[PDB]
């Protein structure tokens, strides 16, 4: 049906990044259950916050220190930068 | 928003999952931006160390392969995804020290 | 004038707090984010508009 | 056509399936297996195929885990003939029983 | 009946190979069998739970998912 | 007079398997625990709570380092433990990647 | 700085954790690995704080962080 | 002055009749006030993903069945299924 | 209120509060929260029942938490539920090693 998946979106990052290499259907798949995961992972880590503070919203700031929460020191740095910059920018 | 954002994660899917989520009761406005933003760094972070496990092999379709092999030469990646283990994946060729003939 | 370094000097100003803005239509939607675009009307309508 | 001393066919195997990818179980007994214990907890299943081929995956990774954790406990242990109370040091010190 | 045989002594010698072990015992392979049957005792437990639940007379493959997302173990690739 | 050894070693197994009482003491601890924070942010203040928390914390995840580490000690064929059963425990813990 | 952690309390530790005999270099690998799990979890607890704008570490950032470990911890409300 | 919450009458009358000449300290009550709280998140959580993975947001007391026969080891789970169909049964047949 | 309506200890309406603030789905149904209330109660019926057999263990009347930890410990079951959770003031078993036995 109407099920959908990341795919196209994915594909456009890969053509902006290594602009002549393809891939196949599993590969995509398993790119989709990543996203999946990690879109599950920080936004159930979202909504603890939310409760630990009493706070019934959800603005940047939660996200901004989730991912602070779960990935370690460089890459999260990098998040938050990329972030940032993407937020001030819209 | 895409185009306000100049990402490609669509912020509009993001924001209809996070309407359908059971996190809070409001969303707001930039929180999604920042979501996708973030998401779109790890897709990089992940397919350019695919595109060299592509590389080294002379390869031009990514396998599944090639993407645990790009899992595991990182450092950083093996910490987070360390309890996650990929289908048709094989592990690191590894041998040990006492293993090889004298 | 190119020398007129002070032109330059007030307009440095203008430019960097415009900087914000590195593209088309995210700019003609800044303006209907104010153009009389009653909300709701999609981007690409605000855009138009 | 030679024989040569044991332990050239042992690295030869462990370079020629760390190339490898797929499977090292077969499919038809790790199926029937499945139903075995299957049935016993109801009667008169049905499966889909990629379910057990999942199942398949989960088993030959956490035997992989095993054997890495048995072979760096054997190596600790100064030996390489691996015994059973190996297993039984790492099934302790995972905790999962 | 005897399909804990159908894992055979080969492919315990293939998954040790692949694993890095050198020297298999012959003490080890029945172990490894029952600690395979444990594991999927666990494992299969929790499909057919997930299995009533549905109301349905077939597993699927997302309900494996799922129970392995209870697990710790989480396999992706296969959907969900 | 003199004991043997292992009376000694043996005894206070017994005498301190049965008193939870802390004992890493509360100052050193504490003065560690700032030590660390600090190069977090600059002067932060603390609930004798936390402290507390993270106190019993560290005893009881040494505790259960350590049991894992003997029977690594054990398992190898010896009594003393030595730090490369620590490394071989945490590299099966998943710590270590 | 470190050597608070003194060696007779190792010592204890060890009678507690099952361990008869030690030898010398588990002093320094114990406070090697001491001091790797005290800088994740007061990691995550201030990051918590951080969120909580606040310049106290409370008791329940520590259960909670501890709980983002997989470490859950009693007794405290949590 | 802000009014906190516990479970200390609750369980300590479940205590009374178990153990009548038995006493507690406050401090295991803590203890097991955390406990339960573990024990409700975790199973709300369980039944959070078998909402998520049915389709469905109407939680009868057949999620929660399915998720005590998970989150808790078999036996005891079968005890936990026979006290809570009997508080059902007892709860919807009288008023 | 409901809570005598089935013969417990444990509320239904503070439970039935926080299936709603907790946000755990959109909607809660009538009798779920009395279910829990039941599978809580018999939870720690069997851990208090433990813990009054480790409170006549050592002769004392009040319960102490090391009465706790080893109750919880001894079972099986309750020692794989409440394995991966420590508990404050709660020590360890009395373990020796029997290898380690002097001769």
Redesign the interface.
Known sequence: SRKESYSIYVYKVLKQVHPDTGISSKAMGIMNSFVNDIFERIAGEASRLAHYNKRSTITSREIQTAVRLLLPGELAKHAVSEGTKAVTKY | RSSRAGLQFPVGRVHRLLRKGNYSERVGAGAPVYLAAVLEYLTAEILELAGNAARDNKKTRIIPRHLQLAIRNDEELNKLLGRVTIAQGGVLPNIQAVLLPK | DENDWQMLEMLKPCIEEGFVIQDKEVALDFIGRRGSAALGIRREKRIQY | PHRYRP??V??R???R??????L???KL??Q???R???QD??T?????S??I???Q????????G????????A????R????????????????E? | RDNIQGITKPAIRRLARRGGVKRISGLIYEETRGVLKVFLENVIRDAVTYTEHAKRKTVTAMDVVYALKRQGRTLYGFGG
């Open positions: 332990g050239t042992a690295l195997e462990i370079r399936y760390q190339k490898s990818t797929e090292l179980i077969r007994p790790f029937r297996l499945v075995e214990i299957a907890f109801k008169d299943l049905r499966f889909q990629a379910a081929g999942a199942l995956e989960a088993s030959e990774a956490y035997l992989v095993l054997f890495e954790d048995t072979n760096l406990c190596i600790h242990a100064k390489v003939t691996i015994m059973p109370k190996d297993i039984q040091l790492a099934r302790r010190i995972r905790g029983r």
